[PDB]
Short mmCIF file of N, CA and C and ligand atoms in Angstrom, two decimals:
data_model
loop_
_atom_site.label_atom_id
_atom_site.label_comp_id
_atom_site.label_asym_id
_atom_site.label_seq_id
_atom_site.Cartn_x
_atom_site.Cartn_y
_atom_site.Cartn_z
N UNK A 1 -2.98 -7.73 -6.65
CA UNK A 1 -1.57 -8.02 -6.34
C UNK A 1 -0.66 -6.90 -6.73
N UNK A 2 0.78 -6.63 -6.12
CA UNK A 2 1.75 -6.00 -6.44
C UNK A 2 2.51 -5.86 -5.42
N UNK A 3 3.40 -4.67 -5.91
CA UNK A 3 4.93 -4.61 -4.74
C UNK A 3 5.75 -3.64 -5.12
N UNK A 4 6.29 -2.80 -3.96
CA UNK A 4 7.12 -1.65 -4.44
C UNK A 4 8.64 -2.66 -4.25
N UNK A 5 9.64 -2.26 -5.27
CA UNK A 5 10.97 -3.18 -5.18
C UNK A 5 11.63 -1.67 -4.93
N UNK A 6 12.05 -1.39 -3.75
CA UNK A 6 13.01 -0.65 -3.29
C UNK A 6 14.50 -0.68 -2.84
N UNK A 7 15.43 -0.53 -3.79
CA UNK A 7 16.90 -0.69 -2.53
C UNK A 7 16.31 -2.18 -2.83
N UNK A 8 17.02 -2.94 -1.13
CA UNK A 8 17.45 -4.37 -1.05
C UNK A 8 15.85 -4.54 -0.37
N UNK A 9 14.87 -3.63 -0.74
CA UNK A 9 13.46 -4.29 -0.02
C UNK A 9 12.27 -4.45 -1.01
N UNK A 10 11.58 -4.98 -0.26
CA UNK A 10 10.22 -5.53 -1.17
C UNK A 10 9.21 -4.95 -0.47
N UNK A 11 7.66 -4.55 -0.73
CA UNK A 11 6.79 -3.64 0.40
C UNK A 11 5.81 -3.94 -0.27
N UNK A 12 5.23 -4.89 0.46
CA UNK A 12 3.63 -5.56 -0.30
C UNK A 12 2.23 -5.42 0.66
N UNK A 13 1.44 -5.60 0.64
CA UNK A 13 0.28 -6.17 1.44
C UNK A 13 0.79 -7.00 2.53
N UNK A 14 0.55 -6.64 3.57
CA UNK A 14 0.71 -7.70 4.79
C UNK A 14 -0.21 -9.00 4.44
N UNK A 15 -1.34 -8.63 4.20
CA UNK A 15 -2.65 -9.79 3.73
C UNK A 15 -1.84 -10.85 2.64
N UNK A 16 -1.72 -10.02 2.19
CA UNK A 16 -0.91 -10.57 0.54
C UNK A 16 0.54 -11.35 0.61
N UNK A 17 1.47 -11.47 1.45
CA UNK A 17 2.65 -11.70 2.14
C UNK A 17 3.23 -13.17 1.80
N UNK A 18 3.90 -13.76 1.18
CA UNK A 18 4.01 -14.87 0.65
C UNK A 18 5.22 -15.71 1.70
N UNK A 19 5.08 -17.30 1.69
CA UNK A 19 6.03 -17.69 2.27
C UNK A 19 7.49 -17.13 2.63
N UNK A 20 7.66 -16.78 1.12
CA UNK A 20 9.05 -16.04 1.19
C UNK A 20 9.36 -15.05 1.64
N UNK A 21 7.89 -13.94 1.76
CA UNK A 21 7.89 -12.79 2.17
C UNK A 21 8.34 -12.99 4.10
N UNK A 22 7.81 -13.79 4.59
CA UNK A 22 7.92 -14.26 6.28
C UNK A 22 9.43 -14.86 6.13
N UNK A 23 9.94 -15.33 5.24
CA UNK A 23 11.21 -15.97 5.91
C UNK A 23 12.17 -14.79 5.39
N UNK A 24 11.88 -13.95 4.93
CA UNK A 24 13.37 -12.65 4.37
C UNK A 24 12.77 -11.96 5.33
N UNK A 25 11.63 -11.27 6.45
CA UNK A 25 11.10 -10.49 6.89
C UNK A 25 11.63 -9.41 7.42
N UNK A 26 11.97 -8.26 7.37
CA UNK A 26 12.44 -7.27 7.75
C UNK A 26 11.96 -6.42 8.47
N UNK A 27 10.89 -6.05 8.28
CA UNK A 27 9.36 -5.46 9.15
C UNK A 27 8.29 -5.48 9.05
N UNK A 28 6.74 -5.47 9.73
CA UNK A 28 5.71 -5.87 9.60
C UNK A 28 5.18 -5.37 10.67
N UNK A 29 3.47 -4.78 9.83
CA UNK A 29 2.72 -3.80 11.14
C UNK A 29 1.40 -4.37 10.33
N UNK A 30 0.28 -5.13 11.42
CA UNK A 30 -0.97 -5.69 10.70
C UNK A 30 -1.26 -4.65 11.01
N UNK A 31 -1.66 -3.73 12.50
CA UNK A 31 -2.38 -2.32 12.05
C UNK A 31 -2.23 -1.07 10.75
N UNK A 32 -1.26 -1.55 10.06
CA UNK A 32 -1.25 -0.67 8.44
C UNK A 32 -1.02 -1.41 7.25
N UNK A 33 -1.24 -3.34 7.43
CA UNK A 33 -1.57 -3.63 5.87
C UNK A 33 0.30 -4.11 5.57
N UNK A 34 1.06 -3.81 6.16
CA UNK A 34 1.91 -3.21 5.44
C UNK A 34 3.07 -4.33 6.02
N UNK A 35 3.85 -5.09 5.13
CA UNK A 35 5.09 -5.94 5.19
C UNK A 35 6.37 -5.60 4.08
N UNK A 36 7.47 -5.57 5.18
CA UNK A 36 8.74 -5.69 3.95
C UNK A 36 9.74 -6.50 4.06
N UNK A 37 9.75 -7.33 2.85
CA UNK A 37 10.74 -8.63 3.24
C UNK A 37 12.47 -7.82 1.89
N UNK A 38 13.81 -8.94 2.67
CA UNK A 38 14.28 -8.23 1.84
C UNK A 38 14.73 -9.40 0.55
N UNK A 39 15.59 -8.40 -0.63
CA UNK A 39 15.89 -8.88 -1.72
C UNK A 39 17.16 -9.39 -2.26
N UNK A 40 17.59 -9.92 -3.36
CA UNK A 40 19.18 -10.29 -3.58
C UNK A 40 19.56 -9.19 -4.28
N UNK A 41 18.21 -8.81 -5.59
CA UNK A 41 18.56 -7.69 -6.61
C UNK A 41 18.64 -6.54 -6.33
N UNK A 42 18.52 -5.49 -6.35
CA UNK A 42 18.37 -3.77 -6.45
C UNK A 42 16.57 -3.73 -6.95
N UNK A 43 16.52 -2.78 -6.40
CA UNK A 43 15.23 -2.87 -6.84
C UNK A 43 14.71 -1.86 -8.02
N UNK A 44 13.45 -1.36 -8.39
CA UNK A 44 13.09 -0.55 -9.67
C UNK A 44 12.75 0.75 -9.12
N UNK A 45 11.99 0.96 -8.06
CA UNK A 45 11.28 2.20 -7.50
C UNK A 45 12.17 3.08 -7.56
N UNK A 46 11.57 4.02 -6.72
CA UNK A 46 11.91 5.36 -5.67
C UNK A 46 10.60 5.81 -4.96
N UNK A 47 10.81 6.35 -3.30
CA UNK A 47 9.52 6.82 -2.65
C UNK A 47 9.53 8.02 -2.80
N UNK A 48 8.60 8.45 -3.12
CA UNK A 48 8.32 10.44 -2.48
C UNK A 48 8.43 10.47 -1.44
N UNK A 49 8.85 11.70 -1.09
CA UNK A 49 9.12 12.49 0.35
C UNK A 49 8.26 13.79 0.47
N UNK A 50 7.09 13.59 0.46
CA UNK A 50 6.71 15.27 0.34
C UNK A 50 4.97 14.82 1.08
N UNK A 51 4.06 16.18 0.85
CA UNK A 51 2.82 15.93 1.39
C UNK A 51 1.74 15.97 0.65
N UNK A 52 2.39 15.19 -0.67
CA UNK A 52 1.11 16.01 -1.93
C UNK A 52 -0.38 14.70 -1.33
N UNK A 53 -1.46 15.74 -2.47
CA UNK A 53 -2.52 14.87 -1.73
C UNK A 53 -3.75 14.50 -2.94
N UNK A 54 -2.26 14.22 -4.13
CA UNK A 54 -3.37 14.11 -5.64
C UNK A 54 -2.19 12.91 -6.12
N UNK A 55 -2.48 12.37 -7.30
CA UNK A 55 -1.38 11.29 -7.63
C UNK A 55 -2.64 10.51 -8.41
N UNK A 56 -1.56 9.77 -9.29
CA UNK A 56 -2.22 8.64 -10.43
C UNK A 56 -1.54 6.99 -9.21
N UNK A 57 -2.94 5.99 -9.66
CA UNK A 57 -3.30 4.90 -9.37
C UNK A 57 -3.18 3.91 -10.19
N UNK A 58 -2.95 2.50 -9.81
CA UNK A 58 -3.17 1.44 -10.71
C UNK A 58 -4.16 0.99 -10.58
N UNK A 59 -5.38 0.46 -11.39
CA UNK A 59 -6.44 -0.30 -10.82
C UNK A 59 -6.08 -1.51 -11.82
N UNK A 60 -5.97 -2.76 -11.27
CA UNK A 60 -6.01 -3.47 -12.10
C UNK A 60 -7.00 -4.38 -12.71
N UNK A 61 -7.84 -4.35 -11.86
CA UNK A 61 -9.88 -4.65 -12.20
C UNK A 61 -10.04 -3.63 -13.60
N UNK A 62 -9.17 -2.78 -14.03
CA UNK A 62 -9.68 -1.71 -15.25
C UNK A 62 -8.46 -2.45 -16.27
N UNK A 63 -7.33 -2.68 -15.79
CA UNK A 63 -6.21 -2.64 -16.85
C UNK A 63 -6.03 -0.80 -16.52
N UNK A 64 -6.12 0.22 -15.89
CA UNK A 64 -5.93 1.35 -16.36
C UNK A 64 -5.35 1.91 -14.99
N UNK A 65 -5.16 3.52 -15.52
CA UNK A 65 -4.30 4.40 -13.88
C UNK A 65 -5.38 5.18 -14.27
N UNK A 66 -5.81 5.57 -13.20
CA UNK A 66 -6.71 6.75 -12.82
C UNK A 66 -6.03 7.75 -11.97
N UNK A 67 -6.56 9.20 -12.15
CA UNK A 67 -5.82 10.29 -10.80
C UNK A 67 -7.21 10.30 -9.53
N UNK A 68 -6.51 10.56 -8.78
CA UNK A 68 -7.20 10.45 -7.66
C UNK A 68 -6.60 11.99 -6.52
N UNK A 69 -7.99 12.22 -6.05
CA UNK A 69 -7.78 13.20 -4.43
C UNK A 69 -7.50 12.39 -3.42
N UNK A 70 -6.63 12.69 -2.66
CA UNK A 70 -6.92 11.45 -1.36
C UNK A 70 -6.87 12.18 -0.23
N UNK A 71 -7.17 11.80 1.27
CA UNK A 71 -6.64 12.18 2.59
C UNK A 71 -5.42 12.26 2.66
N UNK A 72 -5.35 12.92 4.02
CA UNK A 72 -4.12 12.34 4.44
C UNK A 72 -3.67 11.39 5.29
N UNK A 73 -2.95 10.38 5.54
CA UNK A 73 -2.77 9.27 6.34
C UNK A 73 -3.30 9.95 7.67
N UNK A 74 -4.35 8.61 8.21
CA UNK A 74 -5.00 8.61 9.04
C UNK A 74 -5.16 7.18 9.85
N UNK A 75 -6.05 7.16 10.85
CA UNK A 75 -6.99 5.81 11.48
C UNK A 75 -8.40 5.90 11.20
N UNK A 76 -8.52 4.77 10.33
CA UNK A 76 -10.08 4.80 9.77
C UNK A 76 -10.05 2.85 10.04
N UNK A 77 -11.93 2.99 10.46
CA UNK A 77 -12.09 1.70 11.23
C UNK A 77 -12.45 1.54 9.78
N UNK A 78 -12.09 -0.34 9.70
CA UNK A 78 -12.39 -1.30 8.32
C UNK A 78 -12.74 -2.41 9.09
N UNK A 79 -14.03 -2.81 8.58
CA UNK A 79 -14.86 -3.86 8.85
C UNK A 79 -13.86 -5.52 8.60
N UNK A 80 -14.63 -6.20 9.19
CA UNK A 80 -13.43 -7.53 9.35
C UNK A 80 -13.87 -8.14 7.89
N UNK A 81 -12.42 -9.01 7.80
CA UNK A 81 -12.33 -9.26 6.60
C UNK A 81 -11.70 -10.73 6.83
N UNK A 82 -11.65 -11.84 5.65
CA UNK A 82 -11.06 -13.31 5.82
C UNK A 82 -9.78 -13.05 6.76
N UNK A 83 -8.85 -11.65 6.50
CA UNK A 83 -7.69 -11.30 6.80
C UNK A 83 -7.51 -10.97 8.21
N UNK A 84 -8.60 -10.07 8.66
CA UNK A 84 -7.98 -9.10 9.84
C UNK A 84 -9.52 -9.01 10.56
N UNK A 85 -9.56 -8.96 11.59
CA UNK A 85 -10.86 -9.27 12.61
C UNK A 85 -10.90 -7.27 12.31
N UNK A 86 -12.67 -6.93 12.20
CA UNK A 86 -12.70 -5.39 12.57
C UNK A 86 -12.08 -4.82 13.72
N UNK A 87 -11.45 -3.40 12.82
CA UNK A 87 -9.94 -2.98 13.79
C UNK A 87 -9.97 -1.43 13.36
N UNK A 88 -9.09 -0.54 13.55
CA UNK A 88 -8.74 0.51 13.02
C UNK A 88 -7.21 0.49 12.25
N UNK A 89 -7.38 0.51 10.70
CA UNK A 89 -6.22 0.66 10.62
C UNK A 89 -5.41 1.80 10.21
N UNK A 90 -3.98 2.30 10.49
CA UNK A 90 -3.72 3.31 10.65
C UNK A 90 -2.95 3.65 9.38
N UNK A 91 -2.37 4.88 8.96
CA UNK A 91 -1.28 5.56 7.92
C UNK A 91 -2.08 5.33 6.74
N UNK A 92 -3.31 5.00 6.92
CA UNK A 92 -4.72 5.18 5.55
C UNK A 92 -4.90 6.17 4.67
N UNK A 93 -5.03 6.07 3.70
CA UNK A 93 -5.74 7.49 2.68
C UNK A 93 -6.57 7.04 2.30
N UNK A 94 -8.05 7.60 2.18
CA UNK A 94 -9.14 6.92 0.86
C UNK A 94 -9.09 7.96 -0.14
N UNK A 95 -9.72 7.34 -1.45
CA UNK A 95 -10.10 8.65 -2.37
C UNK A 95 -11.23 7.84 -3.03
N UNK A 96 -11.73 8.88 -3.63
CA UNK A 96 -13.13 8.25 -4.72
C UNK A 96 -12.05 7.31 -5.94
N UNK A 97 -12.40 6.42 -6.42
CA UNK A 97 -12.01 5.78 -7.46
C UNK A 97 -12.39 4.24 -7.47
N UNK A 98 -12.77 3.80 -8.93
CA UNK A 98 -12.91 2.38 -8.42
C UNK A 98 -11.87 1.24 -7.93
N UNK A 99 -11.92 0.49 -7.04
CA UNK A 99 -11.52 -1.00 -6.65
C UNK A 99 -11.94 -2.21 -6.00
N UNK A 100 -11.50 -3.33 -6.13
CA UNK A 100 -12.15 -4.59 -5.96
C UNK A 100 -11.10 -5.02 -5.32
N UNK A 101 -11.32 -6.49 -4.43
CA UNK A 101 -10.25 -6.96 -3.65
C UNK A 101 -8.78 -7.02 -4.32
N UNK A 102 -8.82 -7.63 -5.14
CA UNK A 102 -7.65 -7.98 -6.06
C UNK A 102 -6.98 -7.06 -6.33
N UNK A 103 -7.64 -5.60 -6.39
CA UNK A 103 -6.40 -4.55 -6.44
C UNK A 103 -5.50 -4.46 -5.78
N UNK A 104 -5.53 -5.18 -4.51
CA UNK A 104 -4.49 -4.28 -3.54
C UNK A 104 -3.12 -4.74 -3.75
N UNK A 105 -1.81 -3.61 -3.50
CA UNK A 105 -1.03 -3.53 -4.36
C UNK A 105 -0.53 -3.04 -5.82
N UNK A 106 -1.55 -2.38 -5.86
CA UNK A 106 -1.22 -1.17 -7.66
C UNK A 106 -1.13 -0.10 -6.39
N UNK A 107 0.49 0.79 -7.17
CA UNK A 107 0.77 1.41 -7.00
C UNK A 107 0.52 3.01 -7.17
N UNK A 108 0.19 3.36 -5.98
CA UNK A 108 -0.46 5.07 -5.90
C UNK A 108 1.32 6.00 -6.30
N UNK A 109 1.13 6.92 -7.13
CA UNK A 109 2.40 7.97 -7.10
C UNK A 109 2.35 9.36 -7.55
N UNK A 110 3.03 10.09 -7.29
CA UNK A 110 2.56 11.79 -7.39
C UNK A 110 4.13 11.91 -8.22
N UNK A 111 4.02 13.47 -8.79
CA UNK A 111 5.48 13.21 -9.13
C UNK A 111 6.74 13.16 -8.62
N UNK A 112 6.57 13.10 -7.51
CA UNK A 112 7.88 12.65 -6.18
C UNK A 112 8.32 11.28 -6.21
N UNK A 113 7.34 10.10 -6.97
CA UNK A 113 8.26 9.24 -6.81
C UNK A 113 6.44 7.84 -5.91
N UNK A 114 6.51 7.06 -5.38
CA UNK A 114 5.77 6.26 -5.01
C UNK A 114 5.33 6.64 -3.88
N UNK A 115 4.13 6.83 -3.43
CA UNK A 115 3.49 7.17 -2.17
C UNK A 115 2.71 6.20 -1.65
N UNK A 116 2.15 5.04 -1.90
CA UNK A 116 1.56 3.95 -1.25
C UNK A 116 1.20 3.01 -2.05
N UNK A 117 0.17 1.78 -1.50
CA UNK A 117 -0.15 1.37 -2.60
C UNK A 117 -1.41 1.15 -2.24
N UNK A 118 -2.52 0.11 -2.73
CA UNK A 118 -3.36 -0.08 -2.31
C UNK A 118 -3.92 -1.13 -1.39
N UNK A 119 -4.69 -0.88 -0.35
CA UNK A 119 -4.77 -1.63 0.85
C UNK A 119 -6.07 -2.02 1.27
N UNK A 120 -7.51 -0.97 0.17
CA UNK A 120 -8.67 -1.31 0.96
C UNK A 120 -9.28 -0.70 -0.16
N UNK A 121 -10.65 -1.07 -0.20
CA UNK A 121 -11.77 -0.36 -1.21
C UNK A 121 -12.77 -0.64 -0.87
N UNK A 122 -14.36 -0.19 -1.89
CA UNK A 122 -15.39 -0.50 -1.82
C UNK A 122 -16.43 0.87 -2.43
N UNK A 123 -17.67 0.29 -2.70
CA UNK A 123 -18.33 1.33 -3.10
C UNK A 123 -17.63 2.62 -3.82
N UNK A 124 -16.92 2.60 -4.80
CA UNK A 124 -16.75 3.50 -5.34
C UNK A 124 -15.63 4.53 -4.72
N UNK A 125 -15.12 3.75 -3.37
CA UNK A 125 -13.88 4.23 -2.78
C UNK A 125 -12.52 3.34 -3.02
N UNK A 126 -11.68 3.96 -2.73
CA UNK A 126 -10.24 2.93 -2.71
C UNK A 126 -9.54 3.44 -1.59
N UNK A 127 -8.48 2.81 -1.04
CA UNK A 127 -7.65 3.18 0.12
C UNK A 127 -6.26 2.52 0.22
N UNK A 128 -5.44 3.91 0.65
CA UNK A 128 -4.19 3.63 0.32
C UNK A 128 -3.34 2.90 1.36
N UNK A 129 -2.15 2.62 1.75
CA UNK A 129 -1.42 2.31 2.91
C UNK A 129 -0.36 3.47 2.40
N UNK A 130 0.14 4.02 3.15
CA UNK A 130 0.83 5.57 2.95
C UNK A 130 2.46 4.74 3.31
N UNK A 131 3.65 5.07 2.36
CA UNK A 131 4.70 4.60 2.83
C UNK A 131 5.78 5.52 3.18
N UNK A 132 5.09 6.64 2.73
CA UNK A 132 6.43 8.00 2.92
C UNK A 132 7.30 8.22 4.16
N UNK A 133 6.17 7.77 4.99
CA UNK A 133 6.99 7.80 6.27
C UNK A 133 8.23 7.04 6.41
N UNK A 134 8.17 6.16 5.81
CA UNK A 134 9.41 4.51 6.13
C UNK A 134 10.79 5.31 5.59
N UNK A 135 11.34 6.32 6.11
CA UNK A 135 12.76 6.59 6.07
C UNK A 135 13.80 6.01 5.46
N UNK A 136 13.72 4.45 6.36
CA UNK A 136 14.71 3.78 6.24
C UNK A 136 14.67 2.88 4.85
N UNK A 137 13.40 2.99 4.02
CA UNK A 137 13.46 2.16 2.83
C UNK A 137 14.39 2.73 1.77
N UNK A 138 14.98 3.98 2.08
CA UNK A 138 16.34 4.34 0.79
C UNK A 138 16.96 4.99 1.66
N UNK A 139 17.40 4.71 2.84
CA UNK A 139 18.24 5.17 3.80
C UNK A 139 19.45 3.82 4.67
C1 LIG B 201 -9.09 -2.98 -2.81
S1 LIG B 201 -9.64 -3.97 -1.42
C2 LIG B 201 -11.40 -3.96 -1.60
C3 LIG B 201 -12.06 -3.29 -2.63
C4 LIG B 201 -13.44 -3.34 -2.70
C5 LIG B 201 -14.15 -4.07 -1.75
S2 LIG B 201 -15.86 -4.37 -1.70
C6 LIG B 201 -15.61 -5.33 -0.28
N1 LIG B 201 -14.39 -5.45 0.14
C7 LIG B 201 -13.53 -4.75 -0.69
C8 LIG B 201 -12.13 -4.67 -0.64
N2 LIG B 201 -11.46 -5.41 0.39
C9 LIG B 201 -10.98 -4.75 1.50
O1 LIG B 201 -11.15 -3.56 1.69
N3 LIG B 201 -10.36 -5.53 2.43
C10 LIG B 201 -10.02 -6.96 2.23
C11 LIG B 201 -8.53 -7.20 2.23
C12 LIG B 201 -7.88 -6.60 3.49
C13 LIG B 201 -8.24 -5.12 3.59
C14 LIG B 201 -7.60 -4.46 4.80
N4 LIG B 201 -6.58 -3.64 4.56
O2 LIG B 201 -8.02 -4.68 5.94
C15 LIG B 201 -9.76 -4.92 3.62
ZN1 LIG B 202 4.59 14.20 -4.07
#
């Protein structure tokens, strides 16, 4: 579980997406994992804007942050899941590091500020949902 609190938005797991998250809904793409509902408060974050391609992780299966190498946002096919029938999903990073389902949502960040969070794992990989692109989340 987790959530970036940005500005008047929230940016969680699409999978993960709570009642409340569908009735504030602001935007939503199942091909990238990725939902943002909005908020009453201000939020805690800030996103990076840049192209770094190293950054510390939350795993929460450890209690710990690990650093990680990653791609760069891509389309990489992910096998079907309770969630999402096998698909390609897109704006992906993997890197070596450990995670388990329950991670998704610890937050990936470089020192720019928040760059994704987590969206997919396995075998000794993890995978990000990339948010840098979303402009409009402090715009
Ligand atoms: C950190 S998630 C994780 C981690 C390890 C392992 S071992 C076997 N399944 C996983 C796993 N789950 C995972 O990749 N998916 C289930 C939730 C929806 C995800 C998606 N974005 O389509 C795909
Ligand atoms: Zn950066």
């Amino acid at each position: 579980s987790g959530a970036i609190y940005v500005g008047n938005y929230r940016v969680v797991n699409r999978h993960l997406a709570t009642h409340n998250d569908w009735a504030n809904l602001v935007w939503e793409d199942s091909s990238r994992d990725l939902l943002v509902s909005s908020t009453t408060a201000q939020g805690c974050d800030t996103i990076a804007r840049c192209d770094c391609q190293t950054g510390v992780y939350y795993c929460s299966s450890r209690r710990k942050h690990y650093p990680v190498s990653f791609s760069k946002p891509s389309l990489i096919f992910v096998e079907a899941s309770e969630y999402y029938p096998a698909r390609y999903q897109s704006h992906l990073m993997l890197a070596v590091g450990h995670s388990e389902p329950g991670d998704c949502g610890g937050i990936l960040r470089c020192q720019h500020g928040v760059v994704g969070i987590v969206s997919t794992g396995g075998n000794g990989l993890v995978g990000f949902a990339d948010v840098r692109d979303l402009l409009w989340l402090d715009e």
